[PDB]
Design a protein around this nucleic acid. Structure first.
Ligand SMILES: Nc1ncnc2c1ncn2[C@@H]1O[C@H](COP(=O)(O)OP(=O)(O)OP(=O)(O)O)[C@@H](O)[C@H]1O
Ligand SMILES: Nc1ncnc2c1ncn2[C@@H]1O[C@H](COP(=O)(O)OP(=O)(O)OP(=O)(O)O)[C@@H](O)[C@H]1O
Ligand SMILES: Nc1ncnc2c1ncn2[C@@H]1O[C@H](COP(=O)(O)OP(=O)(O)O)[C@@H](O)[C@H]1O
Lengths: 605, 476, 352, 41
DNA sequence: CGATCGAT
DNA sequence: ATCGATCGTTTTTTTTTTTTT
């Protein structure tokens, strides 16, 4: 119409007219960037939409279907007109939204929400696999032997015209298995979280549809935010009825968003993206990373730096067919039952890309061994959480007073980084590439004197094998420090109403994702003399089987340092920093005779 | 109609009378209900037959306000139920065999019931903008949130109301006068800061009772379930570890594994205290070892991304080894328990028993006004209505610290650890920053008593006094 | 056949359908050998019924030469004296171990065959494939499926094979058949002729590992097996061979057993769990079949650590199998003393 | 003995000579000697 | 046992 | 419009093995 033509014109005079990011708008070029990677999932801003023209907030809910259609039509008519080069591969488009100032929890949406604009979240549960449906209606005539032809399709409705090449005849027909258009499919079953329940009763759930563009992203137990829209199967068998219609409700997804989203993710500011390389190459940045660990503690540089390096360190370095070495480490702090340790862990999660929360006393380490049937409706399936979170983290707290039948069980995945099961209808296997939280508790009351460590907490012989970042919150009283930190504490309790967390998140996404460091011969013989310094100074006193894993953890520190620099190679610096930290620690966990490598390394130092 | 029939004959034309148009879900008439079941009256509990159950339905506005454990008042809309099929109804069957001149469905109807009114009584509390028995229709922040300022100012102004209120809820009780002033601070608010994305900051505080036998440490709390909202009590062995957890299932009802709630766990912003903390098994014990401090907890073996959370404080019920406080062993051997929880609990207040005749006869002199059925209790200072309303108001204030004792809580705490620099030679003890955290919110709440913001160094000094009380009380 | 490129299951999609392809997966198990044919006659018409697809059966009688007393309403007497017979086996397919199993699990696919690719694939093998991605059923409109199924049109997947082949991961597929040539066997025997082969073979598993050479003079002798020197009485004296090892960690037991898996047929789990043996009950027809997984070492070998770290409810059937090689069964209505020649390697961990 | 027989058998399997001599198996003797002298204490 | 469908 | 001859029509089961705490 005069006005009903102006919808597409508003989109056209939007996507190259409303401009921000200091000129050269996204939707001038963001669409180009969609065509580049061959995605066909352009996404729109409702914020920016209202910043241009508020009008299409009320012109949506009367039929958001037709709004979305009349948009993606514009995307085609622009793309293939200026990118006719595109017109081979897919040549079909639909668009998305990611700005809705609302979260509807479940148990919140009712008959008023019918077939219009929606948002909600939840948790995934078991659902279907990967299937397609149809997309176009065409059959085959047999009275005249012709084709009925292709016919305009309604969402779940018949057409059956008389018009066809068979003298517009041949009411009967048959159908082929080709020359017709297809469309992937997958389903979901959404549950609500165990935090935002009505505090103690059974939860609610409804189902949700995802479509051909949208599959193989979800999984059981994943984090999520979706617009979706409210559905209605228009008849779940109306007749002489129950005391109630047997109706149901679904949501169909337009734009799904993961709320973990552990990939390389963010867009680029036009200039505020070299935020890295205005600063990231300075020499003082060895220690500026420490200032953003956990802004909580006055002391404790050591564990600060250890977690700081090990949050993004890692190298696969798969040699020929032998094995896959490590994207792994097990730093451990066996401190005091009540020095603040369990708080150290949380900021890790609140920055780092993956996780799950688990505390000590988990399962029997089996996990919630199924045989695969369509009896019991599929006999639900998983094996742990390092199966569920690989190349990331999933959390432990207060371990050391747990079932020995778990300390057994986890004792391969750390290092072989491999799972392998049996004891079902299956013996398949699966990948566990992870690292490990620590968070345990000592025995003997609080913490021992410098008297030996094997006496401090009593774990069995074939678990002793691996070990790492050995720190400990040994305590003795300084009143000056008590004054300093307590000022800091009350100051911390006085905030009523160098690095921000705003950025370094992305630095480490970038750092452990893209750059892939190395090593070269510089001084790798010195390592042997220091290993000998272990074996000669430490034989039966302290040297508690610290075999050929922690040594290689030496390399892990060095590679960790250079990725903290985005260096990819190094001189004596990084390795010597590893030697500095290890030299400190293994003096830490001795006897009152505490200075063995100390005396041994003033020449090294 | 309930019995639904797409088939309609015609309106304007002579046209199809079984061939229908398509459907309208767009501009037409829709609505909502749910469906639940109901058991026999617990006010009408006869012998013999079962709890005959009724079917029940709810219209729009009635919805999601029914709930387990609740009694109601319905409509009386008993039904002819447009049912579709059933067995065993082998009575006579009929249908209209029309006029002879020159579709079928078996008929056996069942019963259900419908209702369009609810007063879910015995489940109704109301916060503070509800006008109570005693009110003062005045202007305020909200409707009735403190519109009895006309008195609550007075109940927030006296230097006597501290002790009067300490004595305005123990009329039928007599013992020490330290828990009689400390225990309310458990029910009284904490800190409530407005601050950063560092981590959840807590308002509540751990609280304990120990004492010799038959001291009515139970009767302190037997009433508390009747007292506070959200804060209903039972024991820990009053259920299983389906108190903390739910009842662990291994049979198929909906998806064959269900542990998603508990009994401790549904006490959100009320306390559900427990008795008998000494002989209970070490399962919920190590659960509480972090569930009180790090109120963000998980499980495995059946987890739908298990992340649960405690919310309130606690009340303890210890008793010694021999039943008596025979000073023949250290406290660590007197109770035979662990360290960190003896530090996690920043407040002890043990109730010790003796034998002096005047005391016991004075108790019986309490009893003089326990069965004098007119005047079977002692005088008071402040009625309950105004009391709880002042309590319900005194939170909404944003407590604050800018005080030199806030600056020099460093001083009092430096002295706290100066005098506690020892506590290491004769039966060593441990100091820890949970003590500081607890003193902080303690001082803060002690000024929240004032119906005022902005901490004062009086509160620090009394808090220091009370911490000194507790720690020297820990002395053997 | 071709050498174009292998694809991955994560992309086998609605575009990739009715279309020739190439992949590379791995095999799990697949069916027995049922039946299929192409055409047949019927007495009602006496014509070999010719079909394009590999059902409609129309109305008219064709025993109409009865006068006016004809036989309508589909009177079809299938004459399998006159029918045919080809094969049908339903091969299977799991996806790779590196191609989106990472934050997920691996899916898989089921297959099909007609004539000569039965007796072609034993499961637990690495394939290269050319097949085709197509369906079995059809329909979009509001004839919505089942009871509460099919919002619109979901039909099912599978593939049929047009020209499976196999893998050459060095010797990817060298397990049962022989496409090997006289040059190969000359090579073999002339290395056997070489009297410097065993000590050279003491250095085949440790090209990155040091030491343990007296330890390794028979770590591979395990693999070859000796002799199943059976006798006319019972005394089938024990064929295969078994080994123990245990000691301080930090000494490369795990990687070594991974390699002994690497170097024809083998598997690895360890504790807490290959294989009671498995008597299930068929969800189709509810019969009690036996999947029965040392069967997958029926000539291969086994390696495990974690004998120590798994309880004794499951050690005894395997305590026993490896003295008689006959997996017994007596549980439900079956007494099928199964058997299979597996060995085993035993690593361990001593407490103290 | 019932197993060391299989060690001889493995050796002859390698070199393909069918009939195996005791010098071929002195190697076997020295290898299970590891087990003997292990459980020697 | 029900609807389709043809003619009278 | 009416009657009659045409077309097409189908539903029944309970229990055993391994697994997890
Ligand atoms: N530098 C600090 N900043 C803030 N809080 C601190 C600091 N040092 C100690 N704490 C406090 O000490 C308390 C330690 O208890 P936390 O919740 O950490 O349990 P935990 O120490 O992990 O004990 P456990 O692991 O034995 O259960 C925390 O409340 C923490 O706030
Ligand atoms: N002597 C060695 N030479 C070369 N690499 C070694 C040596 N010893 C160990 N390594 C390396 O150290 C790692 C040892 O891990 P592995 O899983 O073998 O532990 P383990 O010896 O099996 O201990 P456990 O039996 O307690 O698991 C391997 O990745 C291996 O490559
Ligand atoms: N000061 C008091 N006020 C009221 N009742 C008291 C007081 N002192 C003791 N009692 C009575 O003593 C009894 C104490 O028993 P209780 O302490 O509950 O047993 P237990 O020692 O097993 O907890 C209570 O029934 C209570 O009525």
């Amino acid at each position: 119409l005069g006005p009903r033509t102006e919808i597409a014109n508003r989109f056209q005079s939007f996507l190259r007219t409303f401009v921000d990011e200091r000129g050269a708008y996204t939707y001038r070029d963001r669409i180009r960037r969609m065509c580049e990677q061959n995605m066909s999932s352009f996404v729109v801003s409702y914020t920016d939409l209202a910043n241009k023209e508020h009008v299409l907030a009320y012109f949506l809910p009367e039929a958001p279907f037709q709004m979305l259609e009349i948009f993606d039509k514009v995307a085609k008519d622009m793309v293939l007109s200026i990118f006719p080069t595109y017109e081979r591969v897919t040549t079909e488009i639909h668009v998305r939204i990611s700005e809705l100032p609302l979260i509807e929890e479940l148990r919140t949406f009712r008959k008023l929400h019918l077939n219009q604009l929606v948002r909600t979240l939840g948790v995934v549960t078991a659902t279907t696999g990967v299937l397609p449906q149809l997309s176009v209606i065409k059959y085959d005539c047999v009275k005249c032997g012709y084709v009925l032809g292709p016919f305009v399709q309604s969402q779940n409705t018949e057409i059956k015209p008389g018009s066809c090449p068979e003298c517009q005849s041949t009411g009967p027909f048959s159908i082929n298995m080709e020359q017709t258009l297809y469309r992937n499919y997958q389903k979901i079953t959404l549950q609500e979280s165990p935090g935002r329940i009505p505090a103690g009763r059974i939860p609610r759930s409804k189902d949700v549809i995802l479509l051909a563009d949208l599959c193989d992203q979800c999984k059981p137990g994943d984090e999520l935010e979706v617009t979706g829209i409210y559905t209605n199967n228009y008849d779940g068998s109306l007749n002489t009825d129950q005391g109630f219609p047997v109706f149901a409700t679904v949501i169909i997804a337009n734009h799904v968003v993961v709320k973990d989203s552990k990939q390389v993710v963010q867009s680029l500011t036009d200039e505020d993206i070299a935020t890295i390389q205005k600063l990231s190459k300075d020499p003082r940045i060895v220690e500026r990373v420490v200032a953003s660990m956990a802004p909580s503690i006055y002391g404790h540089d050591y564990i600060k730096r250890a977690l700081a390096l090990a949050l993004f360190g890692g190298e696969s370095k798969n040699p020929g067919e032998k094995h896959k070495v490590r994207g792994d480490i097990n730093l451990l702090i066996c401190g005091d039952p009540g020095t603040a340790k369990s708080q150290f862990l949380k900021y890790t999660e609140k920055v780092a890309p993956r996780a799950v929360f688990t505390t000590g006393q988990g399962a029997s380490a089996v996990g919630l061994y199924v045989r695969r049937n369509p009896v019991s409706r599929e006999w639900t399936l998983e094996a742990g959480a390092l199966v569920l979170a690989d190349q990331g983290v999933c959390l432990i707290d207060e371990f050391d007073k747990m079932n020995d039948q778990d300390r057994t069980s986890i004792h391969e995945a750390m290092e072989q980084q491999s799972i392998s099961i049996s004891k079902a209808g299956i013996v398949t296997s699966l990948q566990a590439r992870c690292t490990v939280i620590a968070a345990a508790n000592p025995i003997g009351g609080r913490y021992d004197p410098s008297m030996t460590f094997s006496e401090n907490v009593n774990l069995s012989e074939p678990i002793l094998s691996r070990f790492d970042v050995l720190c400990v919150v040994k305590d003795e009283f300084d009143p000056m420090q008590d004054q300093q930190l307590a000022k800091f504490v009350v100051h911390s309790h006085m905030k009523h109403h160098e690095i921000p967390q705003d950025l370094l998140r992305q630095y480490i996404v970038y750092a452990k994702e893209n750059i892939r460091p190395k090593l070269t011969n510089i001084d790798e013989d010195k390592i042997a003399k220091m290993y000998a310094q272990l074996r000669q100074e430490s034989f039966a006193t302290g040297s508690l089987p610290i075999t050929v894993r922690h040594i290689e953890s030496v390399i892990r520190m060095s590679e960790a340092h250079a990725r903290m620099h985005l260096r990819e190679n190094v001189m004596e610096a990084d390795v010597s920093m590893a030697i500095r930290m290890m030299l400190e620690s293994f003096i830490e966990a001795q006897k009152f005779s505490v200075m063995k490598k100390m005396r041994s390394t003033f020449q090294k130092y | 109609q309930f019995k639904f029939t797409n088939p309609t004959i015609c309106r304007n034309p002579v046209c199809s009378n079984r061939k229908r148009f398509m459907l309208d879900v767009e501009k037409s008439l829709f609505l909502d209900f749910q469906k639940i079941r109901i058991q026999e009256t617990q006010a009408e509990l006869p012998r013999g037959c079962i709890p005959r159950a009724v079917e029940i339905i709810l219209r729009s506005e009635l919805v999601e306000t029914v709930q387990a454990g609740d009694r109601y008042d319905f409509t009386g809309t008993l039904i002819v139920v447009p049912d579709v099929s059933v067995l065993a109804g082998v009575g006579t069957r009929a249908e209209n065999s029309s006029r002879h001149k020159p579709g079928m469905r078996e008929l056996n109807y069942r019963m259900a019931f419908l209702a369009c009114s609810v007063q879910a009584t015995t489940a109704r509390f109301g916060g503070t903008d509800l006008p109570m028995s005693e009110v003062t229709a005045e202007d305020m922040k909200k409707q009735m949130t403190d519109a009895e300022w006309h008195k609550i100012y007075e109940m927030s102004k006296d230097r006597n109301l501290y002790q009067n209120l300490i004595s305005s809820l123990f009329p039928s009780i007599y013992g020490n006068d330290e828990v009689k002033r400390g225990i309310l601070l458990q029910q009284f608010g904490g800190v409530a800061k407005t601050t950063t994305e560092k981590t959840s900051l807590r308002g509540d505080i751990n609280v304990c009772i120990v004492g010799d036998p038959s001291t009515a440490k139970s009767q302190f709390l037997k009433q508390v379930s009747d007292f506070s909202p959200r804060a209903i009590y039972t024991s820990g062995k009053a259920s299983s570890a389906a108190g903390l957890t739910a009842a662990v299932v291994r049979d198929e009802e909906s998806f064959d594994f269900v542990i998603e709630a508990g009994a401790l766990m549904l006490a959100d912003n009320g306390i559900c205290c427990i008795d008998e903390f000494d002989k209970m098994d070490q399962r919920d014990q190590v659960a509480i070892h972090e569930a009180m401090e790090q109120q963000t907890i998980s499980i495995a073996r059946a987890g739908v991304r298990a992340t649960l959370n405690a919310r309130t404080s606690i009340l303890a019920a210890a008793n010694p080894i021999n039943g008596r406080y025979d000073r023949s062993k250290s406290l660590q051997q007197n109770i035979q328990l662990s360290a960190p929880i003896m530090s996690r609990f920043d407040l002890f207040f043990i109730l010790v028993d003796e034998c002096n005749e005047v005391v016991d006869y004075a108790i019986a002199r309490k009893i003089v006004d326990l069965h004098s059925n007119i005047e079977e209790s002692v005088e008071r200072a402040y009625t309950r209505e105004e009391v709880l309303r002042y309590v319900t108001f005194a939170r909404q204030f944003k407590p604050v610290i800018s005080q030199e004792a806030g600056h020099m809580l460093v001083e009092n705490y430096g002295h706290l650890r100066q005098r506690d620099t020892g506590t290491s030679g004769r039966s060593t003890w441990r100091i820890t920053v949970r003590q500081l955290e607890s003193m902080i919110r303690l001082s803060e709440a002690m000024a929240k008593l004032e119906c005022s913001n902005r901490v004062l160094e009086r509160h620090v000094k009394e808090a220091f006094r009370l911490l000194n009380k507790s720690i020297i009380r820990v002395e053997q | 056949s071709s050498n174009a490129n292998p694809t991955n299951i994560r992309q086998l999609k609605s575009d990739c359908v009715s279309k020739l392809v190439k992949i590379a997966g791995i095999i799990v198990a697949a069916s027995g050998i049922s039946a299929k044919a192409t055409r047949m006659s019927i007495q009602c018409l006496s014509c070999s019924t010719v079909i394009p697809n590999l059902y409609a059966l129309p109305r008219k009688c064709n025993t109409e030469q009865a006068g006016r007393p004809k036989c309508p309403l589909d009177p079809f007497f299938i004459m399998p004296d006159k029918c045919k017979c080809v094969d049908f086996q339903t091969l299977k397919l799991q996806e790779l171990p590196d191609f989106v199993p990472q934050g997920e699990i691996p899916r898989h696919l089921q297959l099909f065959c007609d004539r000569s690719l039965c007796e072609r694939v034993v499961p637990g093998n690495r394939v290269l494939i050319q097949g085709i991605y197509s369906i079995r059923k059809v329909g979009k409109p509001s004839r919505r499926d089942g009871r509460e199924k099919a919002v619109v049109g979901v039909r099912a997947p599978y593939m049929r094979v047009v020209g499976i082949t196999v893998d050459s991961e060095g010797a990817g597929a060298i397990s049962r058949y022989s496409n090997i040539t006289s040059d190969e066997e000359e090579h073999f025997r002339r290395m056997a002729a070489s009297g410097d082969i065993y000590e050279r073979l003491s250095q085949s598993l440790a090209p990155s590992i040091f030491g343990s050479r007296d330890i390794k003079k028979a770590i591979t002798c395990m693999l070859f097996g000796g002799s199943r020197k059976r006798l006319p009485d019972g005394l089938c004296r024990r064929g295969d061979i078994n080994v123990l090892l245990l000691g301080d960690p930090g000494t490369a037991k795990s990687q070594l057993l991974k390699f002994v898996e690497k170097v024809p047929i083998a598997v690895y789990t360890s504790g807490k769990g290959s294989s009671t043996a498995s008597v299930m009950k068929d969800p189709q027809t509810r019969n009690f079949v036996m999947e029965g997984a040392m069967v997958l070492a029926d000539g291969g070998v086994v390696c495990i650590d974690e004998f120590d770290k798994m309880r004794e409810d499951d050690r005894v059937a395997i305590h026993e199998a490896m003295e008689q090689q006959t997996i017994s069964i007596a549980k439900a209505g079956i007494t099928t003393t199964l058997n299979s020649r597996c060995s085993v390697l035993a690593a361990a961990n001593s407490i103290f | 003995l019932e197993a060391v027989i299989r060690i001889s058998e493995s050796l002859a399997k390698i070199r393909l000579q069918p009939f195996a001599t005791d010098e071929h198996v002195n190697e076997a003797l020295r290898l299970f000697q590891v087990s003997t002298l292990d459980a020697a204490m």
